[PDB]
Design an enzyme around this catalytic site. Sequence first.
Site, PDB file in Angstrom:
ATOM      1  N   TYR A  19     -10.034   4.645   0.424  1.00 52.89           N
ATOM      2  CA  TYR A  19     -10.711   4.253   1.653  1.00 52.89           C
ATOM      3  C   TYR A  19     -10.670   5.302   2.765  1.00 52.89           C
ATOM      4  O   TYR A  19     -11.179   5.054   3.858  1.00 52.89           O
ATOM      5  CB  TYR A  19     -10.102   2.940   2.149  1.00 52.89           C
ATOM      6  CG  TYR A  19     -10.281   1.807   1.163  1.00 52.89           C
ATOM      7  CD1 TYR A  19      -9.193   1.243   0.506  1.00 52.89           C
ATOM      8  CD2 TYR A  19     -11.548   1.316   0.873  1.00 52.89           C
ATOM      9  CE1 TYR A  19      -9.366   0.201  -0.405  1.00 52.89           C
ATOM     10  CE2 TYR A  19     -11.733   0.290  -0.036  1.00 52.89           C
ATOM     11  CZ  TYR A  19     -10.642  -0.270  -0.673  1.00 52.89           C
ATOM     12  OH  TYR A  19     -10.838  -1.294  -1.576  1.00 52.89           O
ATOM     13  N   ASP A  43       0.909  -3.899   2.195  1.00 63.75           N
ATOM     14  CA  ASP A  43       0.896  -2.763   1.291  1.00 63.75           C
ATOM     15  C   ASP A  43       2.132  -1.908   1.535  1.00 63.75           C
ATOM     16  O   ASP A  43       2.078  -0.673   1.643  1.00 63.75           O
ATOM     17  CB  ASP A  43      -0.415  -1.983   1.418  1.00 63.75           C
ATOM     18  CG  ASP A  43      -0.633  -0.963   0.282  1.00 63.75           C
ATOM     19  OD1 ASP A  43      -0.226  -1.189  -0.871  1.00 63.75           O
ATOM     20  OD2 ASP A  43      -1.273   0.055   0.560  1.00 63.75           O
TER      21      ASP A  43
END
Length: 328
Positions: free
Chosen positions: A48, A154
């Site tokens: 990303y 995460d």
Amino acid sequence: GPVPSRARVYTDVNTHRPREYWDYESHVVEWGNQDDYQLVRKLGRGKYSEVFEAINITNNEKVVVKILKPVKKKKIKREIKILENLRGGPNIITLADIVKDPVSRTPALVFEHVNNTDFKQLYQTLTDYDIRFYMYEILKALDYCHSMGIMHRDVKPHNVMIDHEHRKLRLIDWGLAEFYHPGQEYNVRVASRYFKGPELLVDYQMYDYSLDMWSLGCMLASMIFRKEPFFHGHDNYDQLVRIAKVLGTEDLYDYIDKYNIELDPRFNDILGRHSRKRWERFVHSENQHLVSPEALDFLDKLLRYDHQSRLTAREAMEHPYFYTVVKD
Ligand SMILES: Cc1cc(O)c2c(c1)C(=O)c1cc(O)cc(O)c1C2=O
Ligand SMILES: [Cl-]
Ligand SMILES: [Cl-]
């Protein structure tokens, strides 16, 4: 179908805030001057984004520039708002600026320089003392963001940036982080495989901050036992089997039975029956210096199937494991 679940701490933090705090979609971004920053060196590229070492010429200081690959405007407003909400908290990376990249035609986030050294590069060679020190530092960040109604989702070594010289640590990549809203169903496709909690691996969507405490347990287990990764599945299914082979299947069925969850029937030819293993099983002449009763008690209280039974960040900070660590 599934039994609902709610966080046992900071349950209602967003419900009491003003919309603007959590309604990130409606966030109006505030753009600085891309000209202030000169890219120097590409550091990494993920799914990303690309991350660059840069310099801000308007003060000569090193920064880190993260050029957001196009994904979804929500996710871009999400990360930016979360970073602004958390800015200044203990051990949270500091968003310094947001500018438009003229080439990419997308937002670039500018962060205050951290050394180019993630935790994965060092966490396998730390002393027992330093594992505890840096765990407590991570815990500061997690309790901070959880207290502010945010789960990182995460947690993993690569997302911990460490300056071992100055004994400094920052929690980074808030690109998967989300606001906790009690009763809300989240996407289970978050976190890296080895750090995914059982709730994700059994497709339970009504999860909370406690997900991060499972990932932290996976990091602790890996450091104290020197086994990288501790739960090493070849895919998301075997990941759960890997966990089952340590925590046992009886407690797994108790968990899913508690939440009236039904496993993928894929699991029947793969999961087997496993006893809970004692943690002393993973201790050997090469990691015993990193293992103690306190470590093992602590880990045991992190690595539990039932996301509701895990230590919270704050409880984790109280654990006898951190008594030897000098506090500021
Ligand atoms: C190899 C590498 C070095 C870094 O300094 C960062 C990153 C990666 C990184 O992904 C990152 C993400 C982020 O959201 C904030 C950061 O400061 C960063 C980083 O600072
Ligand atoms: Cl998502
Ligand atoms: Cl917590």
